[PDB]
Tab-separated table of C-alpha atoms in Angstrom:
chain	number	residue	atom	x	y	z
A	1	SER	CA	-1.584	-13.593	18.866
A	2	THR	CA	0.568	-12.768	15.856
A	3	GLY	CA	0.509	-13.300	12.106
A	4	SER	CA	3.180	-13.325	9.404
A	5	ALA	CA	2.597	-13.475	5.666
A	6	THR	CA	4.819	-13.126	2.621
A	7	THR	CA	3.956	-10.403	0.131
A	8	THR	CA	5.049	-10.775	-3.496
A	9	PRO	CA	5.369	-8.253	-6.335
A	10	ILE	CA	2.754	-8.741	-9.060
A	11	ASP	CA	5.186	-8.016	-11.867
A	12	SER	CA	8.795	-7.160	-12.695
A	13	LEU	CA	8.305	-3.458	-11.853
A	14	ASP	CA	6.924	-3.912	-8.311
A	15	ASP	CA	3.698	-2.207	-9.474
A	16	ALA	CA	1.962	-3.676	-6.429
A	17	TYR	CA	2.295	-6.544	-3.974
A	18	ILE	CA	-0.090	-9.418	-3.240
A	19	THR	CA	-0.457	-11.333	0.003
A	20	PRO	CA	-2.454	-14.565	0.356
A	21	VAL	CA	-5.521	-14.292	2.610
A	22	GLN	CA	-7.773	-17.107	3.803
A	23	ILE	CA	-11.502	-16.299	3.732
A	24	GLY	CA	-14.325	-18.537	4.913
A	25	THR	CA	-14.754	-22.161	5.911
A	26	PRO	CA	-13.315	-24.174	4.264
A	27	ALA	CA	-10.677	-21.597	3.454
A	28	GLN	CA	-10.833	-19.785	0.149
A	29	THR	CA	-7.424	-18.250	-0.513
A	30	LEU	CA	-7.379	-14.960	-2.396
A	31	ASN	CA	-4.359	-12.791	-3.201
A	32	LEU	CA	-5.076	-9.316	-1.857
A	33	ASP	CA	-3.345	-5.964	-2.209
A	34	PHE	CA	-2.617	-4.770	1.346
A	35	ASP	CA	-3.319	-1.058	1.240
A	36	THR	CA	-2.374	1.240	4.135
A	37	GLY	CA	-4.075	4.070	2.197
A	38	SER	CA	-7.626	2.669	2.393
A	39	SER	CA	-9.844	0.860	4.838
A	40	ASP	CA	-12.055	-1.601	2.922
A	41	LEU	CA	-11.426	-5.335	2.582
A	42	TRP	CA	-13.107	-6.095	-0.749
A	43	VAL	CA	-12.902	-9.087	-3.053
A	44	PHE	CA	-13.789	-10.338	-6.478
A	45	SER	CA	-16.642	-12.730	-5.877
A	46	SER	CA	-19.395	-14.935	-7.259
A	47	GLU	CA	-21.472	-11.743	-7.318
A	48	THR	CA	-19.107	-9.730	-9.520
A	49	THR	CA	-20.556	-8.896	-12.955
A	50	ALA	CA	-19.180	-11.721	-15.131
A	51	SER	CA	-17.932	-9.422	-17.903
A	52	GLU	CA	-15.748	-7.645	-15.302
A	53	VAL	CA	-13.974	-10.798	-14.087
A	54	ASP	CA	-10.834	-11.858	-16.040
A	55	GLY	CA	-8.673	-14.483	-14.378
A	56	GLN	CA	-9.077	-13.415	-10.742
A	57	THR	CA	-9.813	-15.890	-7.985
A	58	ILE	CA	-13.262	-15.217	-6.562
A	59	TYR	CA	-14.791	-15.517	-3.114
A	60	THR	CA	-18.006	-17.543	-3.125
A	61	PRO	CA	-19.887	-16.867	0.123
A	62	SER	CA	-22.468	-19.609	-0.547
A	63	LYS	CA	-19.624	-22.148	-0.212
A	64	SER	CA	-18.532	-20.857	3.203
A	65	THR	CA	-20.267	-22.255	6.264
A	66	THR	CA	-19.231	-19.201	8.307
A	67	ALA	CA	-20.392	-16.533	5.799
A	68	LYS	CA	-23.362	-14.352	6.784
A	69	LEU	CA	-24.905	-11.574	4.697
A	70	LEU	CA	-24.564	-8.258	6.513
A	71	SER	CA	-28.132	-7.380	5.657
A	72	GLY	CA	-28.650	-3.959	4.090
A	73	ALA	CA	-24.974	-3.046	3.930
A	74	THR	CA	-23.442	-1.711	0.735
A	75	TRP	CA	-20.072	-0.203	-0.120
A	76	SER	CA	-18.596	1.939	-2.861
A	77	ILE	CA	-15.033	3.187	-3.179
A	78	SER	CA	-12.912	5.270	-5.527
A	79	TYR	CA	-9.123	5.374	-5.376
A	80	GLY	CA	-6.599	8.099	-6.162
A	81	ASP	CA	-5.839	6.489	-9.516
A	82	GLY	CA	-9.475	6.827	-10.601
A	83	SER	CA	-10.341	3.158	-10.208
A	84	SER	CA	-13.419	2.027	-8.293
A	85	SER	CA	-15.522	-0.871	-7.021
A	86	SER	CA	-18.820	-1.425	-5.215
A	87	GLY	CA	-21.077	-4.136	-3.863
A	88	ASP	CA	-22.617	-5.711	-0.782
A	89	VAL	CA	-21.135	-7.168	2.423
A	90	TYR	CA	-20.724	-10.487	4.217
A	91	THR	CA	-19.111	-11.219	7.535
A	92	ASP	CA	-16.801	-14.235	7.563
A	93	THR	CA	-13.626	-15.633	9.109
A	94	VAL	CA	-10.462	-14.076	7.661
A	95	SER	CA	-6.919	-15.245	8.376
A	96	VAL	CA	-3.621	-13.646	7.408
A	97	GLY	CA	-0.406	-15.529	8.026
A	98	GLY	CA	-1.939	-17.561	10.854
A	99	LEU	CA	-3.764	-14.654	12.525
A	100	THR	CA	-7.540	-15.167	12.516
A	101	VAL	CA	-10.366	-12.642	12.783
A	102	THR	CA	-13.928	-13.871	13.112
A	103	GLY	CA	-16.793	-11.658	11.952
A	104	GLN	CA	-14.633	-9.634	9.551
A	105	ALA	CA	-16.547	-7.530	7.021
A	106	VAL	CA	-15.777	-8.987	3.586
A	107	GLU	CA	-17.024	-6.596	0.936
A	108	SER	CA	-18.186	-8.530	-2.098
A	109	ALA	CA	-17.771	-6.687	-5.395
A	110	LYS	CA	-20.756	-6.490	-7.699
A	111	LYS	CA	-18.911	-4.057	-9.962
A	112	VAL	CA	-15.243	-3.239	-10.517
A	113	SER	CA	-13.631	-0.684	-12.856
A	114	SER	CA	-11.580	-1.740	-15.876
A	115	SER	CA	-8.222	-1.354	-14.134
A	116	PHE	CA	-9.180	-4.086	-11.680
A	117	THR	CA	-10.586	-6.392	-14.362
A	118	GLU	CA	-7.402	-5.959	-16.403
A	119	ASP	CA	-5.154	-6.944	-13.519
A	120	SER	CA	-5.463	-10.710	-13.247
A	121	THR	CA	-3.092	-10.940	-10.284
A	122	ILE	CA	-5.108	-8.905	-7.736
A	123	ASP	CA	-8.177	-10.626	-6.252
A	124	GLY	CA	-9.095	-7.665	-4.067
A	125	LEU	CA	-7.793	-5.194	-1.485
A	126	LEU	CA	-7.241	-5.387	2.257
A	127	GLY	CA	-7.329	-1.908	3.750
A	128	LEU	CA	-5.010	-1.011	6.628
A	129	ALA	CA	-5.695	2.714	7.055
A	130	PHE	CA	-7.947	3.857	9.892
A	131	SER	CA	-11.468	2.472	10.056
A	132	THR	CA	-12.948	5.985	9.834
A	133	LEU	CA	-12.309	5.733	6.061
A	134	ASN	CA	-14.300	2.517	5.645
A	135	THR	CA	-17.072	2.987	3.063
A	136	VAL	CA	-19.668	0.507	4.304
A	137	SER	CA	-23.105	2.069	4.723
A	138	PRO	CA	-25.211	2.444	6.795
A	139	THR	CA	-22.977	0.817	9.417
A	140	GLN	CA	-19.270	1.555	8.983
A	141	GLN	CA	-17.057	-1.500	9.419
A	142	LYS	CA	-13.646	-2.082	11.002
A	143	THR	CA	-10.459	-3.068	9.172
A	144	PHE	CA	-8.821	-6.459	9.664
A	145	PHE	CA	-6.131	-4.780	11.808
A	146	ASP	CA	-8.674	-2.940	13.959
A	147	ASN	CA	-10.567	-6.179	14.579
A	148	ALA	CA	-7.360	-8.105	15.388
A	149	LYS	CA	-5.806	-5.402	17.548
A	150	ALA	CA	-6.914	-6.331	21.047
A	151	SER	CA	-5.830	-9.943	20.490
A	152	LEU	CA	-2.405	-9.031	19.134
A	153	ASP	CA	0.644	-9.318	21.383
A	154	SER	CA	1.332	-5.677	20.477
A	155	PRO	CA	-1.058	-3.385	18.553
A	156	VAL	CA	1.211	-3.061	15.511
A	157	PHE	CA	1.797	-4.326	12.026
A	158	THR	CA	4.944	-3.995	9.927
A	159	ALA	CA	5.585	-3.687	6.215
A	160	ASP	CA	8.834	-5.022	4.816
A	161	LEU	CA	8.467	-4.720	1.052
A	162	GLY	CA	11.080	-6.144	-1.282
A	163	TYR	CA	12.779	-4.577	-4.270
A	164	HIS	CA	12.070	-6.951	-7.139
A	165	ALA	CA	11.630	-9.625	-4.467
A	166	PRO	CA	9.150	-10.929	-1.899
A	167	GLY	CA	8.771	-9.325	1.505
A	168	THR	CA	6.715	-9.645	4.634
A	169	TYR	CA	3.744	-8.245	6.513
A	170	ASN	CA	3.797	-9.046	10.227
A	171	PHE	CA	0.991	-8.473	12.717
A	172	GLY	CA	1.434	-8.145	16.439
A	173	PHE	CA	5.217	-8.129	16.706
A	174	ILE	CA	8.357	-6.385	15.527
A	175	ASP	CA	10.952	-8.723	13.964
A	176	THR	CA	14.224	-7.310	15.273
A	177	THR	CA	16.187	-9.414	12.748
A	178	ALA	CA	14.502	-7.726	9.776
A	179	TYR	CA	16.246	-4.344	9.908
A	180	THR	CA	19.606	-2.730	10.609
A	181	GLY	CA	20.323	-0.061	13.214
A	182	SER	CA	17.433	1.389	15.173
A	183	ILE	CA	13.793	2.192	14.328
A	184	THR	CA	13.023	5.914	14.381
A	185	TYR	CA	9.449	6.667	15.369
A	186	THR	CA	7.552	9.741	14.252
A	187	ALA	CA	4.133	11.205	15.070
A	188	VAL	CA	1.003	10.311	13.121
A	189	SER	CA	-2.082	12.411	12.452
A	190	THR	CA	-5.249	10.363	11.956
A	191	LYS	CA	-7.385	13.426	11.177
A	192	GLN	CA	-7.810	12.402	7.513
A	193	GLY	CA	-7.937	8.663	8.242
A	194	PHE	CA	-4.444	7.965	6.876
A	195	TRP	CA	-1.061	7.089	8.336
A	196	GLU	CA	-0.094	10.753	7.907
A	197	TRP	CA	3.303	11.963	9.130
A	198	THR	CA	5.848	14.710	8.478
A	199	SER	CA	9.199	13.941	6.900
A	200	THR	CA	12.035	16.216	8.008
A	201	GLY	CA	13.526	16.729	4.537
A	202	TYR	CA	15.410	15.224	1.643
A	203	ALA	CA	18.646	14.857	-0.281
A	204	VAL	CA	19.341	14.038	-3.921
A	205	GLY	CA	22.216	11.628	-4.522
A	206	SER	CA	25.278	12.679	-2.569
A	207	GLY	CA	23.894	16.206	-2.220
A	208	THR	CA	23.435	18.101	1.009
A	209	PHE	CA	20.311	17.427	3.040
A	210	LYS	CA	17.554	20.008	2.812
A	211	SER	CA	15.711	20.448	6.095
A	212	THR	CA	12.057	21.001	5.274
A	213	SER	CA	8.778	19.588	6.549
A	214	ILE	CA	6.951	17.361	4.081
A	215	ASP	CA	3.550	16.128	5.247
A	216	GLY	CA	2.568	12.866	3.601
A	217	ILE	CA	0.963	9.441	3.945
A	218	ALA	CA	2.588	6.039	4.231
A	219	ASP	CA	0.694	4.167	1.519
A	220	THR	CA	1.551	0.585	0.584
A	221	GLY	CA	-1.217	0.668	-2.037
A	222	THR	CA	0.431	3.385	-4.141
A	223	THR	CA	3.324	2.346	-6.408
A	224	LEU	CA	5.349	5.544	-6.611
A	225	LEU	CA	6.695	8.356	-4.424
A	226	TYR	CA	4.684	11.568	-4.917
A	227	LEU	CA	6.254	14.712	-3.485
A	228	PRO	CA	6.002	18.497	-3.918
A	229	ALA	CA	6.917	19.818	-7.368
A	230	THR	CA	9.926	21.714	-5.960
A	231	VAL	CA	11.428	18.498	-4.510
A	232	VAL	CA	10.697	16.447	-7.615
A	233	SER	CA	12.214	19.065	-9.935
A	234	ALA	CA	15.364	19.149	-7.801
A	235	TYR	CA	15.649	15.365	-8.139
A	236	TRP	CA	15.118	15.128	-11.923
A	237	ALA	CA	17.430	18.090	-12.573
A	238	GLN	CA	20.269	15.725	-11.619
A	239	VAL	CA	19.408	13.287	-14.434
A	240	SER	CA	20.653	14.299	-17.889
A	241	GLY	CA	17.768	14.465	-20.334
A	242	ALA	CA	14.975	14.013	-17.788
A	243	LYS	CA	11.815	15.997	-18.338
A	244	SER	CA	8.187	16.187	-17.367
A	245	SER	CA	6.035	14.943	-20.224
A	246	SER	CA	2.412	16.029	-20.321
A	247	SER	CA	1.700	13.337	-22.938
A	248	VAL	CA	3.085	10.514	-20.804
A	249	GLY	CA	1.797	11.852	-17.484
A	250	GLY	CA	4.929	12.700	-15.536
A	251	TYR	CA	8.697	12.703	-15.440
A	252	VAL	CA	10.523	10.485	-17.902
A	253	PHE	CA	14.237	10.010	-18.400
A	254	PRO	CA	16.536	8.418	-20.945
A	255	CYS	CA	16.775	4.698	-20.325
A	256	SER	CA	20.574	5.099	-20.702
A	257	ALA	CA	20.728	7.205	-17.514
A	258	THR	CA	22.083	6.207	-14.128
A	259	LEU	CA	19.669	7.478	-11.465
A	260	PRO	CA	20.849	9.102	-8.223
A	261	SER	CA	19.548	7.940	-4.893
A	262	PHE	CA	16.927	9.897	-2.979
A	263	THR	CA	17.079	10.325	0.784
A	264	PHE	CA	14.129	11.244	3.001
A	265	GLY	CA	14.210	12.315	6.645
A	266	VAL	CA	12.475	10.615	9.527
A	267	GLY	CA	13.256	12.791	12.531
A	268	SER	CA	17.054	12.913	12.716
A	269	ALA	CA	17.288	9.611	10.799
A	270	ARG	CA	17.633	9.111	7.040
A	271	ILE	CA	16.178	6.520	4.652
A	272	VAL	CA	18.046	6.126	1.375
A	273	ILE	CA	16.144	5.036	-1.739
A	274	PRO	CA	18.664	3.606	-4.214
A	275	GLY	CA	18.562	4.997	-7.725
A	276	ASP	CA	17.529	1.630	-9.180
A	277	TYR	CA	14.307	1.733	-7.135
A	278	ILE	CA	13.294	4.886	-9.035
A	279	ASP	CA	13.467	3.200	-12.468
A	280	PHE	CA	10.048	2.045	-13.742
A	281	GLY	CA	11.285	1.090	-17.170
A	282	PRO	CA	10.278	1.922	-20.717
A	283	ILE	CA	7.074	3.935	-21.064
A	284	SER	CA	6.027	1.414	-23.714
A	285	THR	CA	7.698	-1.809	-24.866
A	286	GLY	CA	10.943	-1.063	-26.684
A	287	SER	CA	10.980	2.640	-25.852
A	288	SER	CA	14.195	4.351	-24.803
A	289	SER	CA	12.160	6.731	-22.619
A	290	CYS	CA	11.847	5.377	-19.059
A	291	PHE	CA	9.235	6.306	-16.454
A	292	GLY	CA	10.331	7.885	-13.196
A	293	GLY	CA	9.506	6.517	-9.743
A	294	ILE	CA	9.384	9.950	-8.121
A	295	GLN	CA	6.594	12.161	-9.395
A	296	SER	CA	4.879	15.389	-8.434
A	297	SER	CA	1.989	15.321	-5.988
A	298	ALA	CA	0.681	18.624	-7.354
A	299	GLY	CA	-3.008	18.129	-8.039
A	300	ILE	CA	-3.265	14.995	-5.867
A	301	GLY	CA	-3.684	17.199	-2.823
A	302	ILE	CA	-1.426	15.096	-0.605
A	303	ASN	CA	2.121	13.776	-0.676
A	304	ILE	CA	2.339	9.987	-0.853
A	305	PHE	CA	5.161	7.826	0.432
A	306	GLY	CA	4.252	4.834	-1.735
A	307	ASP	CA	6.086	1.598	-2.393
A	308	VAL	CA	9.156	3.283	-3.939
A	309	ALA	CA	9.853	4.880	-0.558
A	310	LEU	CA	8.495	2.221	1.782
A	311	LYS	CA	10.384	-0.693	0.177
A	312	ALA	CA	13.660	1.046	1.133
A	313	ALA	CA	12.727	0.648	4.825
A	314	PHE	CA	11.326	-1.609	7.503
A	315	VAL	CA	8.133	0.233	8.471
A	316	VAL	CA	6.214	-0.067	11.744
A	317	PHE	CA	2.561	0.905	11.754
A	318	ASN	CA	1.940	1.399	15.470
A	319	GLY	CA	-1.776	1.353	16.269
A	320	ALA	CA	-1.437	2.096	19.965
A	321	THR	CA	-3.857	4.624	21.476
A	322	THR	CA	-1.530	7.316	20.176
A	323	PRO	CA	-0.489	5.922	16.783
A	324	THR	CA	3.007	6.403	15.381
A	325	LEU	CA	5.104	5.279	12.421
A	326	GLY	CA	8.562	3.789	12.662
A	327	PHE	CA	11.205	3.565	9.961
A	328	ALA	CA	14.452	1.585	9.941
A	329	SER	CA	17.038	0.926	7.283
A	330	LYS	CA	17.422	-2.689	6.191
């Protein structure tokens, strides 16, 4: 089997992407944030505290003939941005882009943090990291991908995120028309439950390439590119007037600036992030201070190749027995 679904930015900054997902019978379609940095499929639901629901589409298990309470199971998750959610669990039929999993754990939110309430466009998350990170207790549950894997034509999914435009998540096949040149594959460590890999270095603009190992995660659920402070300082030093602002929470730059590109290494290959991708616009409406798309990972504890980086590439998440990641230009 295969599946193919379009993923669409939630706003004009590409702050996140939503992909329609069919849950239950008859189908209830919710727009979920596909997140390769976590492993829970959770949704706003008829059980979510009413004061914490603001415009989201909810899953109502009592209206699904295939829903079954997973008796005794609860979940609770916190994300790197400090947001959180928790609740109980149903199993139900879940389809993405024509690919169907029966008996998928659908984690129904009883509580969500303010950041989720305030974002009307995201109806929940669909985790695509390794199932060892799943938070369901006392019986850990598998991700949608893990459940689908044995049925897939090939045990892979791909992320093809757009810059200020829709893109695609494919399951079970590699679309050879979706990228240019060749895909370069690189080793993955699953020891922390993430799609963790080592970049071979970086360049700033037309500068020379610095060969240096940068361990990080491929994370579709993180907006920006978070890298070591040394790397980030070298980037922003090439932008007149850029500075790290403690008040704002990272690097800002004059909105009148032209940003250089940023290149990262994948083996001997190179992925170029155009300067425009690094512009996240005024820090507040009307400001002439703009927020940078490359920020320091210092104090996160891990480097994160988030959407800023991933949207510059066609990315293969290879879930074979020995997992790997592939990157191609596009």
